[PDB]
Write a protein that binds this ligand. Structure first.
Ligand SMILES: NC(=O)c1ccc[n+]([C@@H]2O[C@H](COP(=O)([O-])OP(=O)(O)OC[C@H]3O[C@@H](n4cnc5c(N)ncnc54)[C@H](O)[C@@H]3O)[C@@H](O)[C@H]2O)c1
Ligand SMILES: NC(=O)c1ccc[n+]([C@@H]2O[C@H](COP(=O)([O-])OP(=O)(O)OC[C@H]3O[C@@H](n4cnc5c(N)ncnc54)[C@H](O)[C@@H]3O)[C@@H](O)[C@H]2O)c1
Ligand SMILES: NC(=O)c1ccc[n+]([C@@H]2O[C@H](COP(=O)([O-])OP(=O)(O)OC[C@H]3O[C@@H](n4cnc5c(N)ncnc54)[C@H](O)[C@@H]3O)[C@@H](O)[C@H]2O)c1
Ligand SMILES: NC(=O)c1ccc[n+]([C@@H]2O[C@H](COP(=O)([O-])OP(=O)(O)OC[C@H]3O[C@@H](n4cnc5c(N)ncnc54)[C@H](O)[C@@H]3O)[C@@H](O)[C@H]2O)c1
Ligand SMILES: O=C(c1ccc(F)c(O)c1)c1cccc(-c2ccc(O)c(O)c2)n1
Ligand SMILES: O=C(c1ccc(F)c(O)c1)c1cccc(-c2ccc(O)c(O)c2)n1
Ligand SMILES: O=C(c1ccc(F)c(O)c1)c1cccc(-c2ccc(O)c(O)c2)n1
Ligand SMILES: O=C(c1ccc(F)c(O)c1)c1cccc(-c2ccc(O)c(O)c2)n1
Ligand SMILES: OC[C@H]1O[C@@H](O)[C@H](O)[C@@H](O)[C@@H]1O
Ligand SMILES: OC[C@H]1O[C@@H](O)[C@H](O)[C@@H](O)[C@@H]1O
Ligand SMILES: OC[C@H]1O[C@@H](O)[C@H](O)[C@@H](O)[C@@H]1O
Ligand SMILES: OC[C@H]1O[C@@H](O)[C@H](O)[C@@H](O)[C@@H]1O
Ligand code: NA
Ligand code: NA
Ligand code: NA
Ligand code: NA
Lengths: 257, 257, 257, 257
């Protein structure tokens, strides 16, 4: 009942963190529009969850996103929350192995897709005093090795969240982000499979957190439901869901030369 | 039902933010021990709320706190969450008007009282895989005018939260803090009444937030219930409940000389 | 003598902060290559300063930047420091008045131009154990009103600085950023002139800092010389040159509703 | 010549970081008063350095500090910069092994000694438009294992720096802090010697930084000279001298349970 009667759009909701967010909002009583560029996971989720429907939509295609918003309004009559979760982490890449072209393409997905849906949704969010939740990353704040383009995109998302929070505050629309750390998702599994020792990569990922495990999509989903439903004095915050990875010292002649 | 069967201790729970936290936990299904050095508010709250009882306890008195913990265990059989909310903001004081003695006394309340209860509670929190929630302040992070001792105490609380999170992570005990901004409480009203123009002080306090109002104890309480009940991958975080006060530029010859 | 024998490239060095950085490095004993897309300021600076030469270069044009690096090496035989200062702040723009196209173009200048020069310069910086200094902005960290695209670009620069610092640490190349606040430059003057009350805008900009004035290009330049010449244990830092604008509370029914 | 004609007080200047700060200021042309509770190192430094004199002073003793300030003024006629470096890190201690009494004593040194000298020095710093530099720690910001009291003291110092910066800004007195990471000092060597495997502890300390080494007192000293002499638009900043230790992920059933 915590978010009953509300309508939520989750991008990249077909698997991983996005699917966990979809489930959390359905369990809170909301109706959820699952947006994904891939049919497989999202179509099955729509069949599984009564309060959820699937709309095929690539967030990098402006006309897909326009139709996503117009269809949400046509079918459900209101829009209360947009969760900008669609995003990608490329394989580890040394800086000299990156390209400006690949950087631009990653910006299109991780940053501009979030910008585009938010812009198209804002007129409806103003009517409902709704809110925006962007899924950024801990690595936007602290950096990550072999990931210059990805880190840059997430630093942009977190900063953009604060700017938009300032601009939308007079209209009662809150804008927040969640910065997850290592969350066990199909992306994590796919990237690990490309590594020389996948099991050692997964173990290193678990041990990066003081809690000694990776996080779950359900845990990111609970943070999202909190931000939407019970955080009415929170705007422009970065909610860390990281297991403590940012805390303390870790493994990163004369001792000082 | 979100925190049903759990036992929570809230210090300074007789009024203000603490009372809002008490109410939020009772509404989540928890049994709550209200600790306060003053009888008036906490005794009335115990009569009002079925799931809440009042224990007179000054957090600066080690034997009061020992009895608080032993009585909680004797009466309820477990301890799941400690909310260290007791604290005070002195009237605005220029740095040359402060004293080392007054600074020490404020440290006793705002920092050492939180340390003492946490230490005595930790053996029980380990048995229940419980958690600690410290009420710090936004001003520990960004500073505040005419408040050198207070700001220092809250910077200490936020830092201590991270250190304790590291130490207790192997035992499954999470340690987090909430940093509120301007929250409308009896302390805020009392300090405003001492100002030359109380109404102008209250207006300035409301306008420090992009949201254009101060926060409510209930909003801090909802953040506390989230941290206790649904933030299982969060440890060592600082959850801002500030209305956006930290965002953007505000009012703080040649233009550059 | 503090940076004698070293070779520094400063982008956008023809006026404003960039020119202040050029002057600071020349005064430290370095030879400086002034890069700018506009001839006027940079050509005059080359005539004025013995240790400085001007190379016309638009950082958004990959071939301009390739020639900038090859000409620096051809003329001076080494490269020790790249200062990525070229950037632009658009006029204040409400979020619904921005466009994805304008956002992409601002990313090209503020983010990708910094990426491109850094990538082309890194092989030479590795040989000299040199360093990178990116000019970001305080608003990447705290947000700014009516500036969603700009804020996003600077959040990206600050994050990218940390990622690149991690990647280049094994090679002894440090990567840092400076985040200025309000600095009195021709850009500041030009934007103020577009405002309804330019003098009131300039006054508000001065009063956003506890120091009560805006900063000078020379002050950013001194921070840059420090990072290049005397900060050998600093990598991935964000050096704030803001006059305290981020500190404390400022101007951003019932008091809590 | 960068700080010629200026008078600087450095507490705990007899060895370690403090001695490095003393040397850096003497090399900049300043006259330096070395304060230390121990005679051995500081007396030798006074003999070694023409521009430096030694005054025996325990910063926890208010009358020692009063005499430190009055003697500095009597002997040199002005006071331009106070560097609050005196401090201590206890051996690693689990939270249940700490005491409120030991916590209070560490607060007396690490926090209140800095407060007391700053308060007594401020009337003279106002006359000279001087500045305060507090030596905090990276661990105040990110936490540290087995160090609850120490971390709390440094979180307090960093926060207090921001509060005092706000209060002293109208008088032209800047207040900044340096947060070092692992710096190779006699304290580091002494603590390592208490460990089961001292060499392994030292190696782990070096590898906590992406730069792969610990820092030097001279590097902290250069940051201090920058803050005093060339950072006229910096107030309330935390200057990280950490080798990148805060960046990126490090070493801190199902993968997510
Ligand atoms: N997994 C982690 O450890 C982690 C950590 C921090 C942040 N994040 C962020 O969380 C988000 C989700 O990550 P994940 O691990 O669940 O990834 P994932 O690859 O498992 O799932 C991403 C989903 O988004 C969809 N998607 C991708 N591009 C899209 C597009 N153009 N339009 C619409 N949908 C699109 C995919 O089809 C997929 O269903 C991303 O923004 C990622 O950067 C993940
Ligand atoms: N009100 C705000 O704007 C604000 C903002 C940020 C943080 N905070 C923090 O929130 C907490 C509560 O603030 P508030 O505004 O509700 O204050 P308040 O004065 O209205 O309520 C504080 C309560 O704590 C009790 N208390 C005080 N000293 C105690 C002691 N020694 N032992 C036990 N109980 C004690 C008081 O009797 C009172 O019931 C404090 O830690 C404060 O620093 C408040
Ligand atoms: N002025 C401030 O208050 C302020 C505050 C924070 C950050 N900054 C940043 O500092 C930097 C300089 O700002 P400023 O105020 O000195 O601006 P400015 O407009 O006065 O000077 C910018 C210079 O960069 C040049 N430039 C622009 N586009 C270029 C391109 N494509 N290639 C090469 N040169 C190019 C311009 O011709 C000009 O000489 C920018 O990155 C800006 O975002 C400025
Ligand atoms: N060494 C590190 O890795 C490190 C890292 C971060 C911060 N710090 C901080 O740097 C400062 C210096 O650390 P260090 O490693 O050089 O320590 P150190 O023990 O080697 O030197 C400290 C000096 O301060 C003096 N001192 C101690 N108590 C004093 C008192 N009451 N009055 C006057 N002088 C006193 C000591 O006699 C000694 O000369 C401390 O504040 C410490 O917390 C150190
Ligand atoms: O998607 C990943 C991820 C991991 C952590 C994050 F905070 C994040 O935003 C994304 C992920 C998954 C698996 C491996 C990696 C990874 C491992 C080593 C690297 O050098 C790297 O750049 C990425 N990242
Ligand atoms: O208790 C207060 C408070 C306000 C904001 C906080 F973040 C906080 O932790 C505490 C409060 C209430 C009313 C006025 C003030 C206040 C106003 C002006 C001042 O200069 C000051 O130091 C405090 N503080
Ligand atoms: O270039 C400017 C600037 C100002 C501050 C910054 F930190 C920064 O990175 C850039 C600038 C100059 C003059 C006015 C403004 C400005 C004023 C009001 C605004 O709403 C806005 O978005 C920008 N910005
Ligand atoms: O003084 C030390 C120190 C180290 C790093 C810091 F940032 C700092 O402020 C102080 C130091 C020196 C040698 C060992 C340790 C240390 C090692 C393991 C620990 O668990 C611990 O609490 C401290 N700290
Ligand atoms: O593929 C790795 C993990 O991805 C998550 O999104 C799923 O909830 C898990 O069932 C799965 O183990
Ligand atoms: O005293 C100011 C405010 O304090 C809060 O704790 C109460 O919930 C309000 O009823 C009251 O208006
Ligand atoms: O145009 C505003 C300011 O821009 C700065 O870059 C120049 O150094 C100043 O001479 C000028 O007053
Ligand atoms: O004792 C460890 C180190 O402490 C530093 O303060 C000294 O400058 C070094 O000579 C010494 O190796
Ligand atoms: Na369905
Ligand atoms: Na009751
Ligand atoms: Na020249
Ligand atoms: Na001497």
């Amino acid at each position: 009942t915590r978010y009953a009667g509300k309508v939520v759009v989750v991008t990249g909701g077909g698997r991983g963190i996005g699917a966990g967010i979809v489930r959390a909002f359905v369990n809170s009583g909301a109706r959820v529009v699952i947006c994904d560029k891939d049919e497989s996971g999202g179509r099955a989720l729509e069949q599984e969850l009564p309060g959820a429907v699937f709309i095929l939509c690539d967030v990098t295609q402006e006309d897909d996103v326009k139709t996503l918003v117009s269809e949400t309004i046509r079918r459900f009559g209101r829009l209360d929350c947009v969760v900008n979760n669609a995003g990608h982490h490329p394989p580890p890449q040394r800086p000299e192995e990156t390209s400006a072209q690949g950087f631009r393409q990653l910006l299109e997905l991780n940053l501009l897709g979030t910008y585009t849906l938010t812009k198209l949704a804002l007129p409806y969010l103003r009517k409902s005093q709704g809110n925006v939740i962007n899924i950024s990353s801990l690595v936007g704040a602290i950096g990550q090795a072999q990931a210059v383009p990805y880190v840059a995109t997430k630093g942009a998302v977190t900063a953009m969240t604060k700017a938009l929070a300032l601009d939308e505050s007079p209209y009662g629309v809150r804008v927040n982000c969640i910065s997850p750390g290592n969350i066990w998702t199909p992306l994590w599994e796919e990237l690990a499979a490309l590594m020389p020792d996948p099991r050692a990569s997964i173990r290193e990922g678990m041990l990066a957190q003081p809690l000694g495990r990776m996080g779950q999509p359900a845990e990111v989903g609970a943070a999202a439901v909190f931000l939407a439903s019970e955080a009415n004095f929170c705007t422009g915050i970065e909610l860390l869901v990281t297991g403590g990875a940012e805390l303390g010292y870790g493994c990163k002649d004369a001792p000082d030369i």
